[PDB]
């Protein structure tokens, strides 16, 4: 049922925080598929399409939608069928579970010794990369935006001081001021779109614009289940459902960064240029 | 007066008149030092005027205080020529001082007239933090019955922008407040950007509340006009080429680095609206040089 379909999901996220919202949903979809007491290939298919959607309502991050779409895609005689569906699904889950590791290996080599890295907000993938640089005995320092409204940035600084890397938290407003001190920018993303750009915490776009104006490379680190079937041209093309996950106050939770503002993306599919994403997205979705 | 003498006065001057420019607050305090100074020698006076200026900059790091001071002191220090008795100078210095104070009393309005042209109707304007000059430029637009909308950042860490939004709301001007982090996100929705300045430096760049550089750089990438409204007394004798060149004096009012102002290069500025006329950044040096020489 939905209500403890949701509680399973939320519970899977509450007990492991550093678990991606997507992967949490896949396990909730996997477990749902297991407990499904139906008797029709047909009613199973529907109820899964109802479960994925029910999950997308409670947490409307773009990655739980795209990851959900990809996992259900990968799942392609009810007694028989059901079983191997679960085995394909558990194979798919097994693969996206090494994604963070392969990214760490890939990206951390682009960090020169004595580099000072500028990042935005909290990214579990960025932190795994920087952890891998510490593992590789590389010495570096970090600037991170405090990142209103939830102040994820201090969460990242505190995590980063536990590995004894010098980290300084700056105001969101000070990114233009601090850009000259950085040698490169690394950020994560909630979603990677078809044109090679990204959807990430509000403030990413302006960091990328200030980075291009001082010719500082701008690197993105994201798993391939974040590849989403969208092609934005402006900020209004990002669907409002992923944007909120006479005085007034607008407050979007993420903005969009165009491919022209992005140097490379480091992914479990390999190092990519923004223009190259489209060919890799096709291969990813058809497979 | 003495040191806590000036500080108490100066702090009180702005305490009761919030809209009063900080530099003007210093000029009045400095004037009151000339009126209350009972010394009886010329350069001992001047020399101690050069200590009140420095003692004042200690409590308010705004770079306008230093610039406005030096221009007033340099302007009144022309009294010594052809006024030998220390009591003759003093009298005409006070005179020249209140003359000076009266000129800059006209600076905000002279600006709000020069800039009402560039606010076309139906315009969407973006600004940063709270600027009394910006506020008066818009007051003049609404006064001329012109229709326009505003976006403004909240501007950490004091949320000055929520106070700028409060005022424009009282003008029934449609306004919206966004996060400092959303300026890149919101730029496309704006037709032009207008900010104030704490200081206009010798290359036509500005020193202004932290977050101004961000906005300027994002405005250039979308080809949006970036207009600066600033009084002629904010012209400071500094030539910063980057953020490091901004002296620590004015950068902090006092690991987490929290500067209060950044530098915005002339490359990033379309026009400056000052009480000396509408200037391109490149025309600010020669204008500044004249101002400090006459
Ligand atoms: O890299 P992660 O942790 O998966 O999340 C990626 C992104 O999620 C959110 O949008 C924010 O927290 C960003 O800071 C982060 O980059
Ligand atoms: O326009 P004014 O009142 O001179 O303000 C000068 C400046 O003061 C501070 O630096 C900030 O509040 C800025 O927003 C403002 O531009």
Numbering used by the authors:
A (entry chain A): 2 to 77, 85 to 253, 265 to 306
B (entry chain C): 1 to 254, 267 to 306
Task: Show passages lifted from the paper.
Eukaryotic translation initiation factor 2B (eIF2B) is the decameric guanine nucleotide exchange factor (GEF) for the GTPase eukaryotic translation initiation factor 2 (eIF2). Upon delivery of the initiator Met-tRNAi to the site of translation initiation, bound GTP is hydrolyzed and eIF2 is released from the scanning ribosome. eIF2B catalyzes GDP-GTP exchange on eIF2, enabling rebinding of Met-tRNAi to allow for a new cycle of mRNA translation initiation. Two catalytic subcomplexes, each comprised of a γ and ε subunit, decorate the central regulatory core, which is a heterohexamer composed of two α, β and δ subunits. Curiously, the eIF2B regulatory core is related to an ancient family of homo-hexameric sugar phosphate-metabolizing enzymes, with conservation observed between eIF2Bα/β/δ and the archaeal ribose-1,5-bisphosphate isomerase (RBPI).
To confirm that the binding mode for F6P is shared with other sugar phosphates, we determined the 2.7 Å crystal structure of eIF2Bα bound to M6P. Comparison of the F6P and M6P structures revealed a metabolite recognition mechanism employing the same residues in the eIF2Bα pocket. Slight differences in bonding due to the larger size of the M6P sugar could account for the difference in affinity between F6P and M6P. By contrast, the affinity of eIF2Bα for the F6P isomer mannose-6-phosphate (M6P) was considerably weaker, with Kd = 282 ± 35 μM. To identify potential changes in protein conformation upon sugar phosphate binding, we performed pairwise comparisons of eIF2B-F6P and eIF2Bα-M6P with the reported structures of apo eIF2B (PDB 7D4622) and eIF2Bα (PDB 3ECS27). eIF2Bα-M6P aligned to apo eIF2Bα with r.m.s.d. = 0.44 Å, indicating high overall similarity. Curiously, the metabolite binding site in the apo structure is occupied by SO4 molecules from the crystallization buffer. The free eIF2Bα structures also align with eIF2Bα in the context of the holoenzyme (with or without F6P) with r.m.s.d. < 0.9 Å, and interdomain orientations are not significantly changed.
